[PDB]
Amino acid sequence: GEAPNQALLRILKETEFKKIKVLGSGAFGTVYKGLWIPEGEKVKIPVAIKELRSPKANKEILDEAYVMASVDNPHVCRLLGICLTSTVQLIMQLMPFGSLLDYVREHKDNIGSQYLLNWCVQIAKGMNYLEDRRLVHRDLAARNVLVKTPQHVKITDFGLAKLLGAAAKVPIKWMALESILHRIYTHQSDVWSYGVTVWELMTFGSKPYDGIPASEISSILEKGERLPQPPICTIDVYMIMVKCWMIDADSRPKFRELIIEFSKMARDPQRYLVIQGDERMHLPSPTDSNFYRALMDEEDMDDVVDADEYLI
Ligand SMILES: CCS(=O)(=O)n1cc(-c2nc(Nc3cc(Cl)c(N4CCC(N5CCN(C)CC5)CC4)cc3OC)ncc2Cl)c2ccccc21
Numbered sequence: 001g002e003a004p005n006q007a008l009l010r011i012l013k014e015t016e017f018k019k020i021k022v023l024g025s026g027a028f029g030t031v032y033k034g035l036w037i038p039e040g041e042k043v044k045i046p047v048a049i050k051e052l053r054s055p056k057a058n059k060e061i062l063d064e065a066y067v068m069a070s071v072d073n074p075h076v077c078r079l080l081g082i083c084l085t086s087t088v089q090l091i092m093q094l095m096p097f098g099s100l101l102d103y104v105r106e107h108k109d110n111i112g113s114q115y116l117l118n119w120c121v122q123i124a125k126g127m128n129y130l131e132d133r134r135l136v137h138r139d140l141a142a143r144n145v146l147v148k149t150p151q152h153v154k155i156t157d158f159g160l161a162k163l164l165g166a167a168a169k170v171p172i173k174w175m176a177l178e179s180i181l182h183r184i185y186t187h188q189s190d191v192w193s194y195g196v197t198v199w200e201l202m203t204f205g206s207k208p209y210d211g212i213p214a215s216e217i218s219s220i221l222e223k224g225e226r227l228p229q230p231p232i233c234t235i236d237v238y239m240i241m242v243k244c245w246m247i248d249a250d251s252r253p254k255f256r257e258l259i260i261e262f263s264k265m266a267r268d269p270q271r272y273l274v275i276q277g278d279e280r281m282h283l284p285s286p287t288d289s290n291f292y293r294a295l296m297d298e299e300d301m302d303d304v305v306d307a308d309e310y311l312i
Pocket of ligand 1: 025031047093
């Protein structure tokens with residue numbers, strides 16, 4: 001009974017982009033860094049090109065395309081279009097700094113409280129928007145949050161995303177308990193995974209329930225155990241996490257409340273995260289054309305335009 005979905009599916013010519021390097025590869029497929037140069041437009045758009053190594057693969061690729069062509073938010077991944085190759089390619093905005101999980105591990109000693117709490121605000125704004133569109137992500141985790149710049153992050157990987165009805169290689173350590181036992185998925189089960197994601201950020205990228213078998217997790221959670229309080233976490237921040245991990249899903253916070261709560265803490269960050277040497281920290285974000293010549297491995301980057309500025 002929803003409204004008609006009038007999103008546009010853009011079909012892009014494979015001839016007008018260059019694959020530059022593998023970003024990631026697995027059985028799921030490969031993702032390439034690349035440049036998109038629409039003919040006659042005088043712009044070079046950095047992109048990630050997602051592709052598979054099969055009619056069953058094209059079905060799932062196009063389902064993801066259906067989802068991503070229908071979302072438009074600054075904190076959700078941007079689909080530029082698709083290419084009709086033997087196997088369909090998904091063309092997305094390149095996020096130059098990789099995944100937030102890798103970003104907080106590599107930059108652990110230079111990440112202060114202001115950045116941590118702003119990421120929590122932004123992820124929550126992304127999820128609140130997905131809720132507004134009646135979409136349940138189902139795979140929220142720090143590995144599925146990407147870094148456009150250290151000041152801006154976006155939720156990605158909708159390969160499991162679904163349209164809610166208060167109803168439904170699964171990542172068990174990020175899942176609500178009612179999803180682990182009953183395969184149910186709500187926005188409130190995304191709040192649980194939101195809690196685990198914050199925990200990952202607050203511990204600078206530790207694996208949740210390290211060493212423990214996923215076979216074991218459901219019983220841990222039934223006993224009442226949860227992830228521990230991270231050293232830098234005041235009880236204000238830790239309490240919010242613990243609320244995302246409650247048994248009654250209607251008792252967990254709403255994404256619009258998480259926006260409000262983390263936003264207030266981002267006003268006085270040192271009062272909520274306690275990090276050795278917080279005032280002395282700074283993270284590099286070169287927006288300039290020198291930065292893209294190095295990442296794209298191209299001599300000429302004068303006409304480079306980020307996808308967020310390239311509209312039609
Ligand atoms: C998230 C699941 S996804 O299937 O939906 N997915 C979406 C994208 C994607 N990535 C991007 N940029 C992007 C992503 C990544 Cl991780 C990297 N890393 C650099 C560090 C590498 N480390 C590895 C560990 N070592 C210790 C140090 C170096 C690893 C790769 C660089 C990037 O750009 C410069 N921009 C848009 C999209 Cl859409 C993606 C990329 C690879 C694999 C799956 C992907």
